[PDB]
Structure formats: structure tokens, C-alpha cells
Write a protein that binds this ligand. Structure first.
Ligand SMILES: C[C@H]1CN(C)CCN1c1cccc(-c2noc([C@@]3(C)CCCc4sc(N)c(C#N)c43)n2)n1
Ligand SMILES: Nc1nc2c(ncn2[C@@H]2O[C@H](COP(=O)(O)OP(=O)(O)O)[C@@H](O)[C@H]2O)c(=O)[nH]1
Ligand SMILES: [Mg+2]
Length: 168
């Protein structure tokens, strides 16, 4: 049968979670997507010759640490932790999202990729070396993306699928 991979995109509001998700789903850059919409989107893709079914949860909204929301995020098999390279605060938030993933999955070994988005912009405030070194601290891959130009989009999602395959 065709394997389905539940991927969850997390990170601060405005970093480009929706734009990255829609680039993968539509193959089109959407510069405007209702920032409150949290939804899931499926796509059949060939990763390493294998046709598999991606189920991408594009998260949104305020913090909620209820049993219900925990249960919901627990369905995720792998996570993209997204920050924007021109927003220091979104990068400084990453450790929170990682800590909540570790908590709800009850594991130090959850498939995860650090994503530096908006790589097309000249307004960088987060050094690539700082981002690579944070991924190194966590033992996870780091991928530089632009939802605008599609730079790195497949790399980010496909790497996460590969991390899930390993973890199994
Ligand atoms: C960085 C912090 C703290 N900061 C002081 C204010 C802004 N902020 C925000 C603001 C909005 C959201 C979040 C947030 N945190 O985790 C989560 C996610 C979705 C990640 C995946 C695992 C779990 S499990 C659970 N119940 C979650 C929930 N909700 C989460 N979303 N965090
Ligand atoms: N230049 C540029 N703008 C982006 C990129 N990704 C998202 N944006 C913009 O960043 C803002 C927030 O994007 P959005 O997808 O809503 O972020 P979300 O809140 O994380 O879902 C919008 O103004 C988008 O047009 C990117 O890679 N490059
Ligand atoms: Mg969004």
C-alpha cells in the first residue's frame, strides 16, 4: 500500500508556514493566506522513487496546551520548525516549539527539520551559521527555504519524510 506521512509545520505567526505548505501543494507562491486558517492538505509525491502520500498540517493560531490540542499534535510523525531569516524573534522562538514537540511526543528522537524561510529577502538578521549551529545542537537537518521562489521547499518536506523512514 502507499505509505502516508503526517507532517506538521510549526513556528511563529508570519514566518511563512502557509506559503511553504501551499508551494508544496499548489506549486504556486501565495503571498496572502488568512493567518488564522489552520488546516491539513494532502499530496501524492515521489520521494526516492517511492510514491507516498503526504498529509501536511499547517498550524496557526494562539498557544493552547489542552489535552485535545496535545492529542492532535501527537498525530504528527515529523515536524518542520520554521523561522524567518529576517526576524530574530521567530528564530529565538524555535526552542519553544522543539520543546513542545519533544513533550507531546514524549521522545528526544522526533523527526524534525529546522527551516530558515524567506531566503529570497536581503534583510537578513539571523546568520546562516547561527541557524546551522542550532540544528547541530539538536542533531537535526537545517534547510534554507523561500516560499516565494520555491528554494528548498521539496528539500525541507522530503528530508522530513526521510527522517521519518529512518526513525521507523
Ligand atoms: C513561542 C511561544 C511562547 N511565546 C512566549 C508566545 C508565543 N508562542 C507561541 C505562540 C503560538 C503558538 C505556540 C506554540 N507552541 O507550541 C505550539 C505547537 C503547535 C507546536 C507543536 C507541538 C505542540 S503541542 C501544543 N499543545 C501546541 C500548541 N499550542 C504545540 N505552538 N507558541
Ligand atoms: N519574501 C518572502 N515573503 C514570504 C515568504 N514566505 C512567506 N512570505 C510572506 O510572509 C508573510 C507571512 O506568510 P504566511 O504564509 O502567512 O505565514 P504563516 O503565518 O507562518 O502561515 C506574508 O506577507 C507572506 O507573503 C518567503 O519565502 N519570502
Ligand atoms: Mg498561516
Amino acid at each position: 500500500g502507499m505509505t502516508e506521512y503526517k507532517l506538521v509545520v510549526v513556528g511563529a505567526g508570519g514566518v511563512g508556514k502557509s506559503a511553504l505548505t501551499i508551494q508544496l501543494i499548489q506549486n504556486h507562491f501565495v503571498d496572502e493566506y488568512d493567518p488564522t486558517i489552520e488546516d491539513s492538505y494532502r499530496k501524492q509525491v515521489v520521494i526516492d522513487g517511492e510514491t507516498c502520500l503526504l498529509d501536511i498540517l499547517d498550524t496557526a493560531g494562539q498557544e493552547e496546551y489542552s489535552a485535545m490540542r496535545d492529542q492532535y499534535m501527537r498525530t504528527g510523525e515529523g515536524f518542520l520548525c520554521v523561522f524567518a531569516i529576517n526576524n530574530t524573534k521567530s528564530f529565538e522562538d524555535i526552542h519553544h516549539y522543539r520543546e513542545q514537540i519533544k513533550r507531546v511526543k514524549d521522545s528526544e528522537d522526533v523527526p524534525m527539520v529546522l527551516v530558515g524561510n524567506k531566503s529570497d529577502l536581503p534583510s537578513r538578521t539571523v546568520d546562516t551559521k547561527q541557524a546551522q549551529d542550532l540544528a547541530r545542537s539538536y542533531g537535526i537537518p537545517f534547510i534554507e527555504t523561500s516560499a516565494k521562489t520555491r528554494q528548498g521547499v521539496d528539500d525541507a518536506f522530503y528530508t522530513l519524510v526521510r527522517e521519518i523512514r529512518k526513525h521507523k
